[PDB]
């Protein structure tokens, strides 16, 4: 068969500079067999070029495709952060369907710090025997960052979990989410809650926290 | 012409799953119609096509177990694919394509739909909880507040969070959901606004757990 090969892996690029996606085919391929398509964060992928180089309707003159035979290529003249998503090649032959792997496209961007609140457990979680607490770092870059809880100024481990989101279409940022899970009981037998986020964008580690008796 | 699949979301594993889209502003009869799928955090795999009058055409390594129809008096084609595993949890999208009506003319999956996400597991579904992230002066910082609300406890996947109905869009953060020691997942979603506005304005999320056929609405306070 025939298979497509998307280069490279992940791109990284600041607004303003050009992105050139590579496709590569285990053979030669039909230009109108050869489309583009764009996947922005948990969406639907869409059609970007069709025809090797034509493209669809209502999509940004930035981006334009070309290339023959075995090398065609995806072009976006200036990035901008609206275009960060996953960019896949897609080629049909033999009564198949087939895509490459995908190239990522992050933007690179001046360092954010992150802006850090806290959230004490509501009083209905309580009621129900289980205690979260929330600690947020909104909107910064780069993605790297480390964050403690500390009970009573002492350091926990294996209690709490993270997650980030993906990058923002318009600043570029990433904003964390730290939840430290308790018992209720755990939770009562103790004051300070306090979180610690050490950011690259920080000049001195910041800690946020609250006692248990607002 | 807009597209839209709907099916369940939760198949126990074995058995098999049945997913239908309905076109809207356009018509079944002299399109083809494809099925695909994204696993998690992965690449699209094209699952196979129907024409209206009939004909399919599936990919190789599915073909044993996939079936497309068509109901060209519903707008509507349905896929099946038989005895779903674990492998088998991915986001199935319908997209029109990728041959041409036009004999002569490109080859291209557009239109697509919204995709829906079909996770195969045992476990039973189960709602979500809804709490609420009270804006603290622990979580302010000028003339901006932030507020959410934790999504706990629900199974599979996914949850969907808006505010004020869908009024409010801006500043909007809802994370990934991720997978407690329970076998449950659990979300956050937060939005920052004006710190002058939380005396005036009501902010409530939106909670939508499909599988569970769950919703809830929060009200947000101080």
């Known amino acids: 068969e025939i298979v497509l090969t998307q280069s490279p892996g992940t791109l990284s690029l600041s607004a303003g500079e050009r992105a050139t996606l590579s496709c590569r085919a285990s053979?030669?391929?039909?230009?109108?067999?050869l489309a583009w398509y764009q996947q922005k964060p948990g969406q639907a992928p869409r059609l970007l070029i069709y025809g090797a180089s034509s493209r669809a309707t209502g999509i940004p003159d930035r981006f334009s495709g070309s290339g023959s035979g075995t090398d065609f290529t995806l072009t976006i003249s200036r990035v901008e952060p609206e275009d960060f998503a996953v960019y896949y090649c897609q080629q049909y032959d033999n009564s198949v369907c087939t895509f490459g792997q995908g190239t990522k496209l992050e933007i690179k961007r001046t360092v954010a710090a992150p802006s850090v609140f806290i959230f004490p457990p509501s009083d209905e979680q309580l009621k129900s025997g289980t205690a979260s607490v929330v600690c947020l770092l909104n909107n910064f870059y780069p993605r790297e960052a480390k964050v403690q809880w500390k009970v009573d100024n002492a350091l926990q481990s294996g209690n709490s979990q993270e997650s980030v989101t993906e990058q923002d279409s318009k600043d570029s940022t990433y904003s964390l989410s730290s939840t430290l899970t308790l018992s209720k009981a755990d939770y009562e037998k103790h004051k300070v809650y306090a979180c610690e986020v050490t950011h690259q964008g920080l000049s001195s580690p910041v800690t946020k926290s609250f006692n248990r008796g607002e | 012409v807009q597209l839209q699949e709907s099916g369940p979301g939760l198949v126990k594993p074995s058995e098999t799953l049945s997913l239908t889209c309905t076109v809207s502003?356009?018509?079944?009869?002299?399109?083809?119609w494809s099925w695909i799928r994204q696993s998690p955090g992965k690449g699209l795999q094209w699952i196979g096509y129907?024409?209206?009058?009939?004909?399919?055409n599936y990919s190789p390594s599915l073909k044993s177990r996939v079936t497309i129809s068509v109901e060209t008096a519903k707008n509507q084609f349905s896929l099946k694919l038989t005895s779903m595993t674990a492998a088998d949890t991915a986001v199935y999208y319908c997209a029109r394509g990728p041959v041409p009506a036009v004999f002569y003319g490109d080859y291209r999956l557009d239109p697509w739909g919204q995709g829906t996400l079909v996770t195969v597991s045992s476990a039973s579904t189960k709602g979500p909880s809804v709490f609420p992230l009270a804006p603290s002066s622990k979580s302010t910082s000028g003339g901006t507040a932030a507020l959410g609300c934790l999504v706990k406890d629900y199974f599979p996947e996914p949850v969907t969070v808006s505010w004020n109905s869908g009024a409010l869009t801006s500043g909007v953060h809802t994370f990934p959901a991720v997978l407690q020691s329970s076998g449950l997942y659990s979300l956050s979603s937060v939005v920052t606004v004006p710190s002058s506005s939380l005396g005036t304005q009501t902010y409530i999320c939106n909670v939508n757990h499909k599988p569970s056929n769950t919703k809830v609405d929060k009200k947000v306070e101080p």
């Open positions: 502003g356009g018509s079944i009869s002299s399109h083809y």
């Open positions: 129907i024409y209206y009058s009939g004909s399919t």
């Open positions: 053979q030669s391929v039909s230009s109108r067999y």
